[PDB]
Amino acid sequence: ISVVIFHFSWKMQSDVWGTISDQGVVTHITGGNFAQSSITINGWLRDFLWAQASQVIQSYGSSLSAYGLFFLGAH
Amino acid sequence: MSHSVKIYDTCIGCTQCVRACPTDVLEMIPWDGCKAKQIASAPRTEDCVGCKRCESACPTDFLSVRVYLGPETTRSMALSY
Amino acid sequence: NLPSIFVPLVGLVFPAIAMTSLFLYVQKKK
Amino acid sequence: AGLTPCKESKAFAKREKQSVKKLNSSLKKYAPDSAPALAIQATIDKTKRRFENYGKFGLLCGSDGLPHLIVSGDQRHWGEFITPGVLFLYIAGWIGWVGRSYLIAVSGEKKPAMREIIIDVELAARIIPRGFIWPVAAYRELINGDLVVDDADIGY
Amino acid sequence: ELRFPRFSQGLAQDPTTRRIWFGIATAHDFESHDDITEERLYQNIFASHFGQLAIIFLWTSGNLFHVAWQGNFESWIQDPLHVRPIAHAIWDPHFGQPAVEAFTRGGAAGPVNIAYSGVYQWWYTIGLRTNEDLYTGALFLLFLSTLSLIASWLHLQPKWKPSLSWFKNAESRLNHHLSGLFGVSSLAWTGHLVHVAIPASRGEYVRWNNFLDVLPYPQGLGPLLTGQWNLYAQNPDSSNHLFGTAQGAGTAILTLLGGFHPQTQSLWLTDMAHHHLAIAFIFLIAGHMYRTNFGIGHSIKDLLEAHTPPGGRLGRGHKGLYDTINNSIHFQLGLALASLGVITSLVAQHMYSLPPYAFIAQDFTTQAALYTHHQYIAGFIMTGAFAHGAIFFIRDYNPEQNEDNVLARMLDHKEAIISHLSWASLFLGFHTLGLYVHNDVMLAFGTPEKQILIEPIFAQWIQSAHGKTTYGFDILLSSTNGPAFNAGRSLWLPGWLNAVNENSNSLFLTIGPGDFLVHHAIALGLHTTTLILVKGALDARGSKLMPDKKDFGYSFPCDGPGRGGTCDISAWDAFYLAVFWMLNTIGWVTFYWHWKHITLWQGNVSQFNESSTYLMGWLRDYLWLNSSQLINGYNPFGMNSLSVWAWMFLFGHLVWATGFMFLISWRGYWQELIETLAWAHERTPLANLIRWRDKPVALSIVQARLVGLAHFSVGYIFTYAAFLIASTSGKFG
Amino acid sequence: GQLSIIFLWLSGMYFHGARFSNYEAWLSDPTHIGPSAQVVWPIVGQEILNGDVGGGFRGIQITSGFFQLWRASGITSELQLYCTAIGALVFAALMLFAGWFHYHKAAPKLAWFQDVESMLNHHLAGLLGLGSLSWAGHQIHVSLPINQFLDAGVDPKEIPLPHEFILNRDLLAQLYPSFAEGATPFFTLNWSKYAEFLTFRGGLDPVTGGLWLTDIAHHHLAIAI
Ligand code: CLA
Ligand SMILES: CC1=C(/C=C/C(C)=C/C=C/C(C)=C/C=C/C=C(C)/C=C/C=C(C)/C=C/C2=C(C)CCCC2(C)C)C(C)(C)CCC1
Ligand SMILES: CC1=C(/C=C/C(C)=C/C=C/C(C)=C\C=C\C=C(C)\C=C\C=C(C)\C=C\C2=C(C)CCCC2(C)C)C(C)(C)CCC1
Ligand code: SF4
Ligand code: SF4
């Protein structure tokens, strides 16, 4: 299950979701890097665990703090 | 002799170890040192698989049948192939 | 020069002879 | 050890300044009289009176603007560690001494097993105050030599 | 016998593959070999030791050979602060082209590896100067290795093997080892320091060709005979000294300065010569204590007997401990490990504060790779000391010859020892974690002042007793009145006090509230680690759950499901669980050393002093932050020098995660899995023509634990060792 | 018992969404106001958890997505979220009572249980079948015409209450002229008259980014049969 919900999270942020320009060009959340960086195990470490854990790690002092604590607490 | 099975003098002759040997090692022989007048005996230690259930059913102070695991043979390892 | 010979010898040959030597000794019977 | 008093440390009076500004930042977006504006204001006053009490009770602040505790026992600072500490040790025995009395009290029954999974509330009520004087009571047990046993340990 | 293993008949007739696995693990256990006798037991050990010296000398001849055949040693000398020391050359035929470029560095011509073992500085200091010194350095050690291999063979033939009484001579051995081994060697190393090393650091090149002409001191070998030794400390190296030449070069050979060499940030040469000369005497005089053949000197048996306290509080005291030690090898080994376990930690602690080699306090990576190395070695060795304590209580202890002495009593109140260890661990665990979560929460809500910052004042008082003036407590050596200050104002204090207040070295770093909380976390590790080992040792002979544990040996799987289940009961398993707490504990130590220094070297000391009070600070600002350069060792854009460390980093994660497979999933499941497989192979056509000689069975219960721990440890070392080197070397600062 | 707890769980969710939420604000600008339906007491500084989810409100931003569920059913009132909360709570007492009754007062026999033909027969027609058809009802008369106002773009406060359509049949005409003839085409097999509110579009709705409620309306009807 864990790899499935990892597969879904990265694929949608990189290839589907994201804002849209008024002009019409689309920029996805992670810039469409799934198709190149997800094939190497180190890729799943740099650009998914390390680069998408920024928000949880520095979530201290704002309303997302309760997630920062649970992140540690669940470890 | 593959494993060594030893029965002490504490045994009260309850025939709970013999009935619990899954491969017919232990057996009961007459005695005169208990009210029941019978003590267990282990004359077929070859086939002894080592399954300590034989002495998880000895109800004495510490134990009266004891099992020491030695070298392993092809039947004391319970190999079917 | 010299590495190009000694690296394979300790990486390929010397393992092979070692494994095949032990395998006979382990599997002997007398 | 060079820890300046918090009522003097400019760093301490800096942290107080930011956290107030940070809260007042979050306030100039709601209505000047809605429920959020009051709750924000409530926490703002709570903060200022928090910093003042830390710069009043003699807490010493380092170069981080943060309080530091002197647990060395310098009795200029007794209410930081020693005074709260004794307050704990009083309580901790009270819990300890009461529980001991109960187990001894129910020890002489047909099966003490049942009176511990199903606690006797009345008996635990006539024992709950005996922990008010545990320092006196225990210290007499130690002298009289009934606080401990010697070599009869398992069974009885 | 009749096949491998030749030393154990019970294993030989085992038909399954269990024999092969167990014929390797029980090779060196000489007691449990069949037909062993007490003469063989020693003679094998004596021959085996010479085998272990052969490896050590052959190992060190490897380093000298490569550093002088593929290394930068002559160039590195010319500028120690800008030339990466070179370990060896790389020839890997899988390398592509951009890797060949990337790993070409250090002024070489092809790929190389940068040496982080710090050999380059050590050989600079002790006087080596070209390649050619190293080649003969290689040959000599190679010869010494050849000599040792002869000895291991020689002392097995008849008419060359010692008898029992020779090994059991505990007195004549302690004289030689104390006076000859420890003693003379230290005296002779002093000789080399003042005949080669010190002259090298003053521009004088002295070698075996000419070392008879040169004088260590222009009036040498006189002033010592007269009694006015007060000349060898006359005119030392000036403050403005360049390590390799004659500028400011004094002529003193033995001094007492105590500071640092200003240029190279190391201890002075002339101090280290004096110190090895001083402790060359202590051991020589300590070596003539015990009686051997000449009617003077103590008897160690007598000393043990005489120390019996009146009043009986120690029972019969140390009576009879002579034979018990002098007849139990597992006892002697236990003591050796305990002493060796300590000083290795001592070595780690002193080297990083008092750099003893020139230009090694500015090679930051070498410092980290050394201090971390020796602590992990010390963590392993210390666990062995208790492990062979347990084997002592099982195999060789005798409950009659040790009647009521100090040793049998430690089996008599084992409940009192075990419980209090449990208390001290619990008290440290609740509050060190307790204050930590509190510090964590208070920062999560945006209030950093509401933390619990306890100033580590006792350690700050001690630092003030050694002269550090930051905390201004004005005590001994920090106050001018003190006679202790006056007693040293003209010998070493001016140099020692100048080093301790310098803010560049690691001598007595400033400590704050962060360092208080970590130290208890360190302290928690030692008690809990001790608790497992000490609980293992004292319950080895027996306990209530199984009061005849001694009849099964040190290591047995379990005792069956009865009486409520007995999984993990052998004293072996106590050592087993212990290693986990050792790796965790040493984890908390090396973590602390690296981060505190990695902030210092950047001059950003505030970052540690604030982030190190709440856990997310350690996870964000140390782990996550410092691994940015490591994980980019290779990406879909390119590779770097750091790729090899990036690869090993994951390789560490992979072995570690394989460890769980053997710890969690236990044997009975896999055994049923093999039987189906060994059926499929017996029915597949073209593949029923090949038959196993040794039947296939799943690993034994103890083997899985050992195998499972081997992966966990290997993966845990390689992972951290990769992050430690890459992150530091990435910035080289 | 397990059935009863779920109802109690549902009751809280509807209650909480009514008393402690910016739902009605969320119905104005659903694109850029986070759904919040939990508000913490400020004791130990933990009021920092009350995030600026916008809409003149504060609180823990939820993610279970009830708000899209309450909009797809045309709730558009705090009052209506309150009454269902009571209704959900009542059933919890009904179920919990029911459990007691059928084990201590009147417990069924074995022969009752083992008759698994009728078991399947009711669940297929009664629970699964009539469940959809009833729900396909509520979508036709309530969720569809109301949400067609909000999607058209109107303040939630002025949308005529859902019992106005079911009474004033002319209002449904002003959106859906097929509602003039009544239910007689359904009885004369002229089913292509209800093509306004029973379709087979597919795709997603450009205005709101979801399915077309006509398809959903048709879907449960097709499933029902
Ligand atoms: C009346 C309760 C009571 C008392 C007086 C003691 C006394 C003692 N325990 Mg202890 N213990 C208890 C309950 C108690 N225990 C319970 C319930 C547990 C299970 C969690 C433990 C687990 C435990 C361990 C693991 C250890 C001790 C140890 C000790 C000794 C040192 C004190 C210490 O470390 O505290 C330890 C304190 C705790 C572990 C905290 C838990 C205790 C709870 C909070 C108290 C329960 C009180 C009771 C429920 C109230 C009854 C009220 C009545 C009117 C109904 C001391 C003899 C240590 C020892 O051997 O040192 C010599 C030791 O290692 N105990
Ligand atoms: C188990 C066992 C064993 C083992 C044991 C062990 C292993 C132990 C260890 C132990 C240890 C591991 C210990 C440690 C110790 C330590 C010490 C004892 C220390 C001390 C210190 C000091 C004394 C110091 C002092 C000083 C100071 C304070 C500072 C200044 C300087 C001076 C010097 C003054 C054996 C084998 C026997 C057998 C039986 C059982
Ligand atoms: C002063 C101070 C300090 C120090 C301290 C110390 C050092 C202490 C020690 C201590 C100790 C060294 C102790 C010992 C003890 C022993 C014992 C032995 C005890 C016992 C106890 C008991 C026995 C009790 C019991 C009880 C009671 C009475 C109550 C509760 C219940 C019970 C029953 C548990 C510091 C620095 C920190 C800070 C400042 C202050
Ligand atoms: S171990 Fe098993 S086979 Fe052996 S005696 Fe006991 S019960 Fe019988
Ligand atoms: S179980 Fe024990 S007591 Fe009973 S017969 Fe066997 S040995 Fe004797």
DSSP letters spanning D116-140: HHTT-TTTTTTTGGGGGSHHHHHHH
What is the tally of structural domains in chain B? 1
Domain hosting D33: range is 1-156
Q: What is the dihedral of CA E118, E122, E123, E125, to 10 degrees?
A: 140
- Ligand 5 pocket test target in B5, B9, B10, B11 with most atoms within 8 Å of CB: B11
**Pocket of ligand 1 contains residue E422 by CB under 6 Å:** yes
Experimental resolution (Å): 3.4
Cα torsion F169, F173, F176, F182: sign: positive
Three-state DSSP at B6 gives strand
First and final CA of chain F: distance in angstroms?
32
Nearest to E641 by CA among E90, E119, E118, E94: E90
Radius of gyration of chain E measured on its C-alpha atoms: 30
Check: CB of residue E535 under 8 Å from CB of residue E574: yes
Domain hosting B77: range is 1-81
Q: How far apart are CA D149 and CA D127, in angstroms?
A: 23
State the chains in contact with D (3 or more Cβ–Cβ pairs under 8 Å). E, F
Three-state DSSP at A30 gives coil
Q: Which helix (H) or strand (E) holds E680?
A: helix E667-683
Q: Does E3 touch chain C (CB under 8 A)?
A: yes
Alpha carbon separation from B72 to E11, E19, E472, E695 (Å, rounded): 8, 10, 71, 13
| 3-state helix/strand/coil string of A35-75 | HHHCCCCCHHHHHHHHCCCHHHHCCCCCCCHHHHHHHHHHC
Residues of chain A contacting E440 with CB distance shorter than 8 Å: 69, 72
* Chains C+D touching (3+ CB pairs under 8 Å): no
- Say whether E15 and B74 touch across the interface (CB within 8 A): yes
Nearest to E368 by CA among E716, E118, E156, E144: E118
Alpha carbon separation from D15 to D18, E9, E532, E613 (Å, rounded): 5, 76, 46, 17
Check: CB of residue F154 under 8 Å from CB of residue F148: no
Q: Does E694 touch chain B (CB under 8 A)?
A: no
- Smallest CA separation from ligand 4 atom 3, residue: B48
**Pocket of ligand 1 contains residue D98 by CB under 6 Å:** yes
Q: For residue E201, how many C-alpha atoms fall within 13 Å in the half-sphere facing its CB? A: 30
Q: How far apart are CA F33 and CA F53, in angstroms?
A: 6
Residues of chain E contacting F46 with CB distance shorter than 8 Å: 445
Show Cβ contacts of residue C18 under 8 Å, excluding neighbours closer than 6 positions: none
- Say whether B81 and E695 touch across the interface (CB within 8 A): yes
Answer whether the bond into residue E218 is a cis peptide, omega within 30°.
Answer: no
Check: CB of residue B67 under 8 Å from CB of residue B56: no
By the 10 Å C-beta count (0-12 exposed, 13-18 middle, 19+ buried), D44 is classed as middle
Residues of chain E contacting D64 with CB distance shorter than 8 Å: 448, 609-610
Check: CB of residue E629 under 8 Å from CB of residue E727: yes
Is residue F148 marked as binding?
no
* Chains F+B touching (3+ CB pairs under 8 Å): no
**Pocket of ligand 3 contains residue D137 by CB under 6 Å:** no
Q: How far apart are CA E703 and CA E26, in angstroms?
A: 12
- Say whether D43 and F47 touch across the interface (CB within 8 A): yes
Q: How far apart are CA F177 and CA E202, in angstroms?
A: 109
The two structure tokens encoding residue D106: 């129910």
Q: In terms of DSSP bridges, do strands F57-61 and F36-38 run parallel, antiparallel, or are they unpaired?
A: antiparallel
Q: Does C20 touch chain E (CB under 8 A)?
A: no
Nearest to E636 by CA among F178, F1, A38: A38
Three-state DSSP at D41 gives helix
Q: How far apart are CA B38 and CA B9, in angstroms?
A: 11
Nearest chain F CA: its distance from E445 CA (Å): 6
Q: E696 φ, ψ to 5°?
A: -85, 125
Q: Which residue has the tokens 């306090």?
A: E361
Distance of CA E492 to the CA centre of its chain: 30
Three-state DSSP at E20 gives helix
Q: For residue E90, how many C-alpha atoms fall within 13 Å in the half-sphere facing its CB? A: 23
Ligand located closest to E410 CA? 2
Alpha carbon separation from E177 to A44, D117, E399 (Å, rounded): 57, 65, 32
First and final CA of chain A: distance in angstroms?
18
**Pocket of ligand 3 contains residue D100 by CB under 6 Å:** yes
Is residue B34 marked as binding?
no
Residue type, E578: A
Nearest atom, ligand 4, residue B17 CA = 7
Alpha carbon separation from E591 to E349, E519, E521, E642 (Å, rounded): 14, 12, 12, 21
Among all residues of chain E, which has the CA nearest to that of F46? E445
Is residue F139 marked as binding?
no
Nearest atom, ligand 5, residue B57 CA = 1
Cα torsion E507, E512, E516, E522: sign: negative
State the chains in contact with A (3 or more Cβ–Cβ pairs under 8 Å). E, F
A→E contacts (Cβ < 8 Å), by residue, are 36-37, 40-43, 45-46, 50, 53, 57-58, 60-62, 65-66, 68-69, 72
Q: How far apart are CA E411 and CA E406, in angstroms?
A: 9
Q: How far apart are CA E308 and CA E353, in angstroms?
A: 42
- Smallest CA separation from ligand 1 atom 39, residue: E426
Check: CB of residue E330 under 8 Å from CB of residue E45: no
**Using CB atoms and an 8 Å cut-off, which of residues 40-69 of chain F contact chain A?**
48-52, 60-61
Three-state DSSP at E548 gives coil
Residues of chain B contacting E688 with CB distance shorter than 8 Å: none
Per-residue burial over E98-136, b if 16 or more Cβ lie within 10 Å, else e, is: ebeebbeebebeebbbbbbebbbbebbbbbbbeeebbee
Alpha carbon separation from E663 to E408, E573, E704 (Å, rounded): 36, 12, 7
Q: How far apart are CA E432 and CA E442, in angstroms?
A: 16
Check: CB of residue E360 under 8 Å from CB of residue E261: no
Check: CB of residue E369 under 8 Å from CB of residue E116: yes
Among all residues of chain D, which has the CA nearest to that of E606? D64
Which residue among E615, E624, E635 places its CB closest to the CB of A72?
Answer: E615
B→E contacts (Cβ < 8 Å), by residue, are 51-53, 55-57, 62, 68-74, 77, 79-81
Nearest atom, ligand 2, residue E386 CA = 1
State the chains in contact with E (3 or more Cβ–Cβ pairs under 8 Å). A, B, C, D, F
Q: E75 φ, ψ to 5°?
A: -75, -40
* Chains E+F touching (3+ CB pairs under 8 Å): yes
Nearest atom, ligand 1, residue E419 CA = 60
Alpha carbon separation from E17 to C18, E11, E227 (Å, rounded): 20, 10, 73
Is residue E667 marked as binding?
no
Nearest chain E CA: its distance from C17 CA (Å): 19
The two structure tokens encoding residue E16: 């399954």
What is the tally of structural domains in chain D? 1
Please tell me the distance between residue E423's alpha carbon and the centre of ligand 3 in angstroms: 12
Q: Which helix (H) or strand (E) holds E25?
A: helix E18-25
- Say whether E457 and D70 touch across the interface (CB within 8 A): yes
Three-state DSSP at F38 gives strand
Q: B5 φ, ψ to 5°?
A: -110, 125
- Smallest CA separation from ligand 2 atom 3, residue: E389
Nearest chain D CA: its distance from F139 CA (Å): 37
Q: In terms of DSSP bridges, do strands E112-114 and E86-89 run parallel, antiparallel, or are they unpaired?
A: antiparallel
Distance of CA E556 to the CA centre of its chain: 29
- Say whether F49 and A63 touch across the interface (CB within 8 A): yes
β-bridge mates for residue D69, sequence order: E454
Residues of chain E contacting A68 with CB distance shorter than 8 Å: 444, 616
Please tell me the distance between residue E487's alpha carbon and the centre of ligand 3 in angstroms: 40
Q: Does E2 touch chain C (CB under 8 A)?
A: yes
Nearest atom, ligand 5, residue B54 CA = 1
- What is chain C's percent helix, strand, coil content, to nearest 5? 85, 0, 15
By the 10 Å C-beta count (0-12 exposed, 13-18 middle, 19+ buried), E539 is classed as buried
Per-residue burial over B30-61, b if 16 or more Cβ lie within 10 Å, else e, is: eeeeeeeebbbbbeebebbbbbbebbbbbeee
- Ligand 2 pocket test target in E318, E329, E330, E342 with most atoms within 8 Å of CB: E342
Using the 8-state DSSP alphabet, how is residue E213 labeled?
T
Among all residues of chain A, which has the CA nearest to that of E635? A43
Residues of chain B contacting E678 with CB distance shorter than 8 Å: 81
